[PDB]
Amino acid sequence: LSVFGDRSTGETIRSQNVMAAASIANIVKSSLGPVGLDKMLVDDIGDVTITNDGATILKLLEVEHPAAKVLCELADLQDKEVGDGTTSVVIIAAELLKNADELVKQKIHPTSVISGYRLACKEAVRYINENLIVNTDELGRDCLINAAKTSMSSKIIGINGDFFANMVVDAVLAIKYTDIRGQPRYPVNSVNILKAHGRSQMESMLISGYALNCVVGSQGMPKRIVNAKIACLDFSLQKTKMKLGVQVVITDPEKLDQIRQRESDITKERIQKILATGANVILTTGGIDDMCLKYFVEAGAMAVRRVLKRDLKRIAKASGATILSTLANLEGEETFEAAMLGQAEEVVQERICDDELILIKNTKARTSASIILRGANDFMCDEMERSLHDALCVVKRVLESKSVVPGGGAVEAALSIYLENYATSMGSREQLAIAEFARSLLVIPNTLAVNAAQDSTDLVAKLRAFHNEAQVNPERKNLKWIGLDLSNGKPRDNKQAGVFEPTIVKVKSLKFATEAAITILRIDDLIKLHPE
Amino acid sequence: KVSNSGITRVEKAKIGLIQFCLSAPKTDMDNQIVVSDYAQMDRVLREERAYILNLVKQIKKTGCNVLLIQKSILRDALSDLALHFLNKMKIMVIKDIEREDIEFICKTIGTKPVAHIDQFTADMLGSAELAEEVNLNGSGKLLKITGCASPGKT
Amino acid sequence: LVLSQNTKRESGRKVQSGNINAAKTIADIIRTCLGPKSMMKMLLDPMGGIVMTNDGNAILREIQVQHPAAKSMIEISRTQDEEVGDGTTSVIILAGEMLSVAEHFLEQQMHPTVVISAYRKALDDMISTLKKISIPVDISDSDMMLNIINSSITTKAISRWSSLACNIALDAVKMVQFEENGRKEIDIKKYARVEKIPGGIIEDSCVLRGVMINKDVTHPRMRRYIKNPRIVLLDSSLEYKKGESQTDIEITREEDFTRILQMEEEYIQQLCEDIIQLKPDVVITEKGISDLAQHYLMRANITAIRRVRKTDNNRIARACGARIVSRPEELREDDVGTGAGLLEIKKIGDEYFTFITDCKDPKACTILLRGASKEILSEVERNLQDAMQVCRNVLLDPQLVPGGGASEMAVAHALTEKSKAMTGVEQWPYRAVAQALEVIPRTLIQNCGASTIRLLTSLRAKHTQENCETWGVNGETGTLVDMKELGIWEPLAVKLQTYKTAVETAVLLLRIDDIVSGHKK
C-alpha cells in the first residue's frame, strides 16, 4: 500500500524483465561478427554518431527500465575491461536470462537455477583453461596480426584489416613499458589517436613518436626544429599577479614605474633562464602571453600553449623531459637545469586538412607511438578511432596474458556439448539449468549465421556434430579440432584461419553474464514511485 | 587518489598524517602583506619559497616518505609549490582526507596526527610494511596499505 | 514503456533503401551544377543575405537536413572542398551514382560486406590505374601552370576573366613560400588574404605586392605617401595601462597628484623616444594609441596606424619582412620595416585604404578584388580560392591527369579487364563500380545538351582502343575530343582524393542498417 505508484509481482514482472532484456538484445543483435552491420543514432538535433561497438550504443541510448540499465552498465564495465564482446556479452546475458526464465516460467525454483548457473560458469572457465592455446611457441607478430584483424572485421576497417593490424602491432610493440619490476605492462590509451578527415585510412599514418593536437602560438615563431631541446612547463607564463591578496600601496610615487617594470621583468628573467639552457621547444598547459611569445621569436625557440595535461605527461615519459610545475631548487633561488630536458629527433607542426598539428618524432629516451586517422567525415573517423581503441585493448590483453582463444564461436561450440555431458553428473534438478545454459549459450553461432543470412540451424548442427566427434575417440590429436566461419557459410579451422580472440574476453564475459543473470533472475517484484 | 606524478609504490614506507596546511601562511584573523618599496617583491617571493622549503625540509628530516593531508576547505589546502618540493624529494602524498576518517586511520595504522611543525617528529611517524596505489577498474585506482608493525584493531 | 519513450526505430532493407534514396536526392539536386556548361546557383540564407555560386560545397553547406545520411554526405562535400577546392563540383554526384548502382545488389540479397571488399579492391585498382595514366609536368614553366588554372576554373563565373584569374592565382601562389623548412618549404593559404571592395570592374582588380589595411591615418600631419618607409610592429598598446596587480595610490602632499599625472606622460614619452631611436617611419599596432604618443610621433614625422586585426598584423609583417614586437625598449633594428617599396593611403571612395607595395621579395600578399557587388565578389573570391588551391596542389605534386571524364573511361575499361580476369561473386560489384564511374561524362553531356546515349557509346568504344587514353568530352561541342589539344587538365591529387572519399562514402553508407532517434543528451 504505497502512494504514487503501483507494484507488480511474480509472473508479470518476470516476463517484463525478460521482455526488456530481449528488447535490449535485439537492439544490438545485428552488430556482431565479421558480417556485423553497424548502428547509427540521429541524436535529437542531427549530430549523428555511427557506431557498432555495443557499449557505445548502450551509453548513448537513454534507458528507463531497471534491468535494461543493469545490462547497459554491464556493457560499460565490459568495455572498461576488454574492448569488444560488447559485441557479444549483452547477447549472452540476455539469452541466458531468457532460457533461465523459461525454466522458471514453468515453476522451477530460482535459487536452484542460480546454483546451476554458478556451477556452469565454474565448469566452463575450467574447461576453457583446458582448451587454451598458448602463443609463446607461435610467432609473436603473426598471432598479434591475427587477433587484431579478427577484431577488425565486424568494424568499418576490417577490409584494411591487414594494414591496420600491421600498424596496431607496430604501435603496441613500440609502447613497451617496464612495470612493477617484474612485469612488462603495456599501457593502453598511452598511444595517441588523432582524427583528421580528408584522405583515406589508406593514407592514415603511424607516427614513430607522439603527436599534438595543438598549434604554434606565434606565427612569426619558426615551424621546424631538427634539434631535440624540448622542455616541458606546467608553470604558466604571465606577468605575474600578487596571486593571493597582496595590495600594492604607494606613498612615494617615484617607484610606480619600476614596479610595473619588474611586473614583466620577472617573467622576462624566468624566460631568459629557461632559454639560456638552450631549450628550443617549450610546452605549457597554462596560458602563454604575447610578452613571452615575442621573446621566444627573438630567441627563435618553439612554444605551445594550452596543451592537455595527459599529453604533456606522455611527452615527459617519451622525451625523458621532466614535468615542471614551477622553477625552484633545493635552495630557494629559482633556477633551471638542462638535465630537465627531453629529446626527440625533430619537431614539426604540419598541415593536415588545413589544420596545423604538432608532431614529435623519435624521442630518444623512450619510444612513443601515435596514430593519425584519415577519413571522409568526422563520423567515420571517430567510429574508427573507437574501433582502434578496441584493437589496442585486445592486443594489450594478448600481450599481458600469453594465451589465446580460437575465434568465431568455437568457445560455446565446445562449451555446449561439454556442459551437456557434465550435466548428467549432478543428478539433481540443476542439470536442467546446466543444459539450458548450454543451449542458450549456443546463441552466438545463431546470431552469426542470421547476420550472415544462411540456414542457421544447419550450420549450428554441423558445428555441434564436429565438436561431438571431437568428444568421441579420445585420440583427438587427429580428432580434436576447432573452428567456424561465415564468409563461405561453412565450418573451417579458425586456428588455421587465424581467427583468434583473447581468452580474457570470453572468460570475463561469461563471468559477468553469470552475475547479471543471478542479479536479474532473483527479481520477483518491482514497486514504482511517481516522483516528488 | 594520489597527487604525486611519478611515485606509485613505496616500500618500507613510514607514514605520517599532518593537519596544518602547506601553503602561504594565512592567519586565522585577517592579514595582508603591504607592498610599498623596492625589495619587497623579491623578498616576498623568495621568502614564501623559503618558508615552504623549511616545511618540506623538516618533513624529510623526520624521515617520512608518505604524506597524509586532511581537508582544509575553510582555507588554503596543500600548495602546489610544496607539492613540487615533495615530489622533488620523492615523498608519497595524498590530499583530501575526510575529518571523519581521521580517527579510523590513526586507529588502523597507529599514527597520531600532527598539527604543528614542531610536534612533527620521528617519534610519531607511523610505519607500515607496504603502501601503494593499486590499479583496478581499468583506470579506477585505489590505495592499499598492507602490513603495519603497530596492529590496529580495526 | 521499455526503451526510451519517444525514440523511433527502423530496420533493414527499409533503412538501406531510405539511405540510398537520400543519397540519390543529394546527388540529384547538384547534377546540373557540374561542367564548363554549368548552371549558376544562388541561395537564400537564413539571416537575409544572398549567396550565388556554382561551387557545390557552399551550395550544400547552405543546406540543413533531417535524414542523417544526407548530413553525412554534406560533411563529405565540405571535407573534399577543404582539402582540394574543386572536385566537389563532381564528388557528391559520383558518390550518389556509386550508391545508386550499389543498391541494385541489395535485392540480390548480396550481403553488404562482400560488396564492400569489392569496393576496396576497386579503389586500389583505380588508384594504381590513375597513377599509370598521369603526366608529370614542370612547375617553373609559367604558361603550363596558367593552362592548368584555366582548365580548373572554366566551370564557374570567372571563365570570361580567365587570363586575369590565372595571372592572379599564379602570382599570388608563386610568391608565398616560407623557405625556412630547408628544401621542404610549405606555402599557406591564410596569408593570401582576399579583400572585396565594390565598384570598379573585374578588370580593375589586380595583385597588390603587399597588404591591404582598411584603416586610416590617425592624425592629419602624417604623410600619406612615402617611398621607402620603415615599419615597426607594436603588438603592445602604446598608451598608459592598468596596473595589472590592482595597485593603489595614497597621496598626501599637494604636488603628488600633479606629479603622478606627469608620470604617465613621462612613460608615454619614454616609449616614444625608444621608438624614434630606431629611425622608423611607420607605426602599426593591434591595440589603441594614445593621442599624446600620437603627438610625439607626429613631432618625429612618423606615420601611425591603430587597432588592426592580428592576422592583418602578421600579414603586414610577412610583407615587409619585419617581425612583430611587443616591447619598445626591446625593439631591434632587425625588425625595422625594410622592404616596403612604397607606403600610400588612397581613397576608394568614402573610405581610406592603406597600400604597402613593391616589396623587395614579398612573401605575403593579399588580392584586391574590385567588381560589381559583394555577392558577385564573393562568388569571384570563392572561384579564386578554388583556383589557387589547385595551384598549390600542383606545387605539391607535378603529376597531371586528363579530365573531361577521360581518366574515368580509362579506369572503366581497366576495371572491366580486371573483372573479366577476376571471376567470383565480387565480380559483379566490381564491374558495377566500373559502370557507375561512367556518369561524370554523362552529366557533362546532359549539361551540354547532346545525345547522351550515342555519345557515351562512341566514347566507350573509342576508349577500348589501347592507343589513346586522352579522348574526353568537350564541354561545349558535345563531341568526342582527345584531351591533349583541348587541354582541360587537372592535378592528380584532386581526382585521387575524389575517388578516395567517394568509395569511403560508399562503404560508410552501405554498412548502415538501422535508425535510432531522440538521444536527449
Full 3-state SS string of A345-384:
CEEEEEEECCEEEEEEECCCCCCCCEEEEEECCHHHHHHH
What grid cell was written down for C102?
550499389
Residue C143 exposed, middle or buried by CB count within 10 Å (0-12, 13-18, 19+): exposed
Report the run of H or E that residue A224 belongs to, with start and end.
strand A224-225
Q: Which chain A positions have a beta carbon within 8 Å of B38's beta carbon?
A: 255, 258
Q: Is A339 on the interface with B (CB under 8 A)?
A: no
Chain A residues within 8 A of B75 when measuring between CB atoms: none
Measured between beta carbons, the chain A residues lying within 8 angstroms of B24 are 244
Side-chain half-sphere of C497: how many Cα atoms within 13 Å? Answer: 27
A517 is written with which cell numbers? 543473470
What is the C-alpha to C-alpha distance for residues A268 and A238, in angstroms, rounded to an integer?
10
**Sign of the dihedral through C-alpha C282, C286, C292, C293:** negative
Measure CB to CB from residue B34 to each of A249, A252, A313 and give the nearest one: A249
Residue showing cell 599625472: C261
* CB contact at 8 A, B6 and B87: yes
CATH fold group of domain B1-153: GroEL (3.50.7)
- Are β-strands C206-208 and C365-370 bridged in parallel, bridged antiparallel, or unpaired? antiparallel
Work out whether strand A247-250 and strand B34-35 pair parallel, antiparallel, or are unpaired.
parallel
Best residue in A239, A246, A254 for a mutation probing chain B (most B CBs within 10 Å): A246
Which one of C180, C327, C497 has the shortest CB-CB distance to A223?
C180
Q: What is the DSSP string of A114-162?
A: HHHHHHHHHHHHHHHHTS-B-SSSS-HHHHHHHHHHHHHTTSTTSTTHH
- The whole-angstrom separation of Cα C72 and Cα C490 is 27
Query: Residue C404, annotated ligand binder?
Result: yes
Pair A257, C241: CB distance under 8 Å: no
Residue among A512, A395, A511, A506 at smallest CA distance from A77: A512
Cα–Cα distance measured from residue A29 to residue A456, given in angstroms and rounded to the nearest whole number: 15
Sign of the C-alpha dihedral, residues A405, A411, A414, A415? positive
C452: left (phi over 0), alpha (psi -120 to 50) or beta: alpha
Please check whether residue A513 is in contact with residue A93, taking contact to mean a CB–CB distance below 8 angstroms.
yes
**A257 contacts on C by Cβ (under 8 Å):** 263, 267
What's the first-to-final CA gap in chain C, in angstroms?
19
Who contacts C509 (Cβ-Cβ below 8 Å, separation ≥6)?
Answer: C19, C20, C23, C69, C72, C99
- At C484, list the grid cell: 591533349
Residue B107 CA, chain-centre distance (Å), reads 19
| Cα–Cα distance, A237 to A396 (Å, whole number) | 39
Does residue C475 contact residue C383 with C-beta atoms inside 8 Å? no
Is A206-400 assigned to CATH 3.40.50.620?
no
Q: Is C424 annotated as a binding residue?
A: no
Report whether C458 contacts C480 (CB < 8 A): yes
* C495 known ligand binder: yes
Task: Calculate Rg over the CA atoms of chain B.
Answer: 17
Rounded distance between C-alpha atoms, residue A204 and residue C421, angstroms: 30
C60, with CB counted inside 10 A (0-12, 13-18, 19+), is buried
Among A51, A56, A87, A447, which one carries the catalytic annotation? A87
Residues whose CB is less than 8 angstroms from the CB of residue A367 and which lie 6 or more positions away in sequence, other chains included: A174, A175, A176, A208, A209, A318
| Catalytic choice (C55, C81, C187, C281) | C55
Burial degree of B150 (CB within 10 A; 0-12, 13-18, 19+):
exposed
CA C282 – CA C301 distance, rounded (Å)? 9
What H or E segment, with its residue span, contains residue C81?
Answer: helix C68-84
d(C-alpha C337, C-alpha A68), whole Å = 70
Which of A241, A376, A453 lies nearest to residue C508, judging by beta carbons?
A376
Catalytic residue chosen out of the listed positions A311, A382, A390, A485: A390
Cβ atoms of C315 and C191 within 8 Å: the answer is: yes
Report the alpha-carbon distance of residue B150 to residue A4 in Å, rounded: 54
A155 assigned binding-site residue? yes
Q: Which helix (H) or strand (E) holds A212?
A: strand A209-212
Helix (H) or strand (E) holding C192: strand C192-197
- B4 and B86 Cβ atoms separated by less than 8 Å: yes
Residue by residue, DSSP assigns C343-389 as EEEEESSSSEEEEEE--SS---EEEEEE-S-HHHHHHHHHHHHHHHH
DSSP state of A281: E
- CB crowding A329-362: b at 16 or more within 10 Å, else e: eeebebebeeebbbbbeebbbeebeeebbbbbbb
- The partner residue sitting opposite A64, judged by closest CB among C1, C113, C326, is C1
The Cα C383–Cα C373 span in angstroms is 15
C-alpha cell of A280?
Answer: 628550443
Any chain B CB within 8 A of the CB of A3? no
Per-residue exposure over A109-138, b if at least 16 CB sit within 10 Å of its own CB, e if not: ebebbbbbbbbbbebbbeebeebeeebeeb
Cell for A120?
Answer: 556452469
**What's the CA gap between A320 and A322, in Å, rounded?**
7
Task: Please list, in sequence order, all residues whose beta carbon lies within 8 angstroms of the beta carbon of residue C159, skipping any fewer than 6 positions away.
Answer: C36, C153
Question: What single DSSP character describes residue B145?
Answer: -
Burial class (CB in 10 A: 0-12, 13-18, 19+), A40: buried
Question: Which of A235, A327, A330, A340 should one mutate to test binding to chain B, selecting the residue with the greatest count of B CBs within 10 A?
Answer: A330
Q: Which residues, in sequence order, are bridge partners of residue C368?
A: C195, C206
Q: Chain A: give the shortest CA distance to residue C383, in Å.
A: 18
Which residue reads 599624446 in cell numbers?
C292
Relative to beta strand A500-502, strand A404-406 is antiparallel
Measured distance CA(C247)–CA(C194) in Å, rounded: 45
Pick from A133, A128, A201: which is nearest to A382 by CA?
Answer: A201
User: DSSP letter at A338?
Assistant: G
For residue C479, how many other CB atoms are within 10 A of its CB? Answer: 12
Q: Which of C508, C510, C520, C521 to mutate to test the interface with A (most CBs of A within 10 A)?
A: C508
**How distant is the Cα of A499 from the closest Cα of chain B, in angstroms?**
26
Catalytic residue, chosen from A56, A86, A363, A503, is A86
Residue B67 phi/psi, 5° resolution?
Answer: -105, 140
* Sheet of B34-35, strand order: B34-35, A247-250, C247-249
Tell me the C-alpha distance between A87 and A85, whole Å. Answer: 4
CA angle A331, A335, A339 (to 5 degrees): 105
Copy the grid coordinates of residue B89: 624529494
Q: Residue C45 catalytic?
A: no
Q: Which residue of A has its CA nearest to B7?
A: A180
For cell 519517444, the residue is C6
C90 assigned ligand-binding residue: yes
Distance from CA of C326 to the nearest CA of A (A): 6
**Any CB–CB contact under 8 A between A251 and chain B?**
yes
Cβ-based contacts under 8 A for chains A and C: 208
The full length of chain C comes to: 521
Question: To probe the interface with C, which of A65, A199, A361, A455 has the most C CB atoms within 10 Å?
Answer: A199
- Subunits close to B (at least 3 CB pairs below 8 A): A
In chain C, the residue whose alpha carbon lies closest to the alpha carbon of A380 is C508
Angstrom distance (rounded) from CA B134 to CA A397 = 18
Q: Which of C125, C281, C335, C386 is catalytic?
A: C386
The answer to whether C63 and C44 are in contact (CB under 8 A) is no
Chains that touch A (3 or more CB pairs under 8 A): B, C
d(CA A341, CA A319): 8
Residues 6+ apart with CB under 8 A from C504: A200, A375, A376, A380, C76
Question: C-alpha distances in angstroms, A59 versus A154, C424, C521?
Answer: 19, 41, 11
CB-based contact A249:B35 (threshold 8 Å): yes
DSSP C219-237: STTS-SEESS--EEEE-S-
Dist CA A375 CA A156 (whole Å)? 11
Resolution rounded to one decimal, in angstroms: 4.5
Q: Which H or E element spans position C474?
A: none
For residue A377, which of C76, C96, C99, C510 has the smallest C-alpha distance? Answer: C76
- All three cell numbers of C90, joined, read 563532381
Tell whether the torsion through CA atoms of A515, A517, A522 and A524 is positive or negative: positive
C388 burial type by CB count under 10 A (0-12 exposed, 13-18 middle, 19+ buried): buried
Grid cell, residue B51, equals 618558508
Coil vs helix vs strand at C29: coil
Question: Do A370 and A212 meet the contact criterion of CB atoms below 8 Å apart?
Answer: no
The angle formed by the CA atoms of residues A377, A379 and A381, to the nearest 5 degrees, is 75
Compute how many other C-beta atoms are within 10 angstroms of the C-beta atom of residue A267.
19
How far apart are the CA of C494 and the nearest CA of chain A, in angstroms?
A: 11
Decide: helix, strand or coil at residue B62.
Answer: coil
Number of H helices, E strands in chain C: 17, 20
CA atoms of A508 and A517, how far apart (whole Å): 14
C87 is in an annotated binding site: yes
C309 chain-A contacts, CB cut-off 8 A: none
Question: Which own/partner contact pairs does A487-493 have at CB distance under 8 Å and 24+ positions apart?
Answer: A487/A34, A487/A35, A487/A452, A487/C114, A489/A449, A489/A452, A489/A454, A489/A459, A490/A459, A490/A462, A491/A459, A491/A462, A491/A463, A491/A466
Residue pointed to by grid coordinates 574508427 = A384
Helices (H), chain B: 40-61, 80-89, 99-109
Interchain pair C82, A353: CB under 8 A: yes
Burial class (CB in 10 A: 0-12, 13-18, 19+), C329: exposed
| C-alpha to C-alpha distance for A49 and A45, rounded to whole angstroms | 11
For residues C390 and C148, the answer to whether their CB atoms sit within 8 Å is yes
B53–A251 C-beta distance less than 8 A: no
Cell of C304: 601611425
d(CA C33, CA C28): 10
Report the gap between the CA of B46 and the closest CA in chain A (Å).
6
Which residues does residue C136 pair with via DSSP β-bridges, in sequence order?
C399
- Picking from C380, C400, C375, the residue whose alpha carbon sits closest to that of residue C133 is C400
Contact assessment for residue C80 and residue C505, using Cβ atoms and an 8 Å cutoff: no
Residue C89 is among the residues annotated as catalytic for this protein: yes
C154 is catalytic: no
> Chain B interface residues facing chain A, Cβ-Cβ under 8 Å?
5, 9, 24, 26, 32-38, 41, 44, 46, 49-50, 53, 80-81, 83-85, 88, 137-139
Q: Do A255 and B83 touch (CB under 8 A)?
A: no
Q: Look at C247 and A353 and tell me if their CB atoms are within 8 Å.
A: no
DSSP C401: E
CA distance B20 to B113: 10
Are A323 and B44 a contacting pair at CB < 8 A?
no
Helix, strand, coil shares, percent, chain C, to 5: 50, 15, 35
**DSSP class of C397:** -
Do A37 and A70 form a contact (C-beta atoms < 8 A)?
Answer: no
Beta pairing class for C206-208 and C480-482: unpaired
- Determine which of A215, A348, A380 to mutate to test the interface with C (most C C-beta atoms within 10 Å): A380
Per-residue DSSP letter, C511: T
Pairing of strands A370-375, A206-207: antiparallel
For strands C489-491 and A7-9, give the pairing: unpaired
Of C362, C2, C369, which is closest to residue C197 (Cα–Cα)?
A: C369
The set of residues, in sequence order, having a beta carbon less than 8 Å from that of B99 and lying 6+ positions away, is B70, B71
Chain C closest-CA separation from residue A375 CA (Å): 7
Helix and strand element counts for chain A (H, E): 17, 17
| A222 min Cα distance to partner chain C (Å) | 8
CA dist., res. B69 & res. A339, Å (int): 31
How large is the C-alpha radius of gyration of chain C? 29
CB contact (8 A) between residue B80 and residue A326: yes
Amino acid at C273: E
Task: Name the strand (E) or helix (H) holding A303.
Answer: strand A302-305
d(CA C80, CA C497): 7
Greatest C-alpha distance within chain B? 58
Q: 604525486: which residue's cell?
A: B4
DSSP-assigned states of every residue in C426-473: THHHHHHHHHHHTHHHHHHHHHHTS-HHHHHHHHHHHTT-TT-S-EEE
In chain B, which ranges are E strands?
A: 9-11, 14-18, 34-35, 66-70, 92-97, 126-127, 130-136, 140-144
Amino acid identity, position A509:
S
Indicate the pairing of strand C231-234 with strand C282-285: parallel
Residue A477 is placed in which grid cell?
590429436
Phi-psi region at C213: left, alpha or beta (left = phi > 0; alpha = psi -120 to 50): beta
**Is residue B91 within 8 Å of residue B64, measured between CB atoms?**
yes
| Cβ separation B49–A330 shorter than 8 A | no
- A76 exposure class (CB count in 10 Å sphere: 0-12, 13-18, 19+): middle
- Residue A147, phi-psi category: left (phi > 0), alpha (psi -120 to 50), beta (remainder): alpha
Q: For chain B, say whether A330 makes contact (Cβ under 8 Å).
A: yes
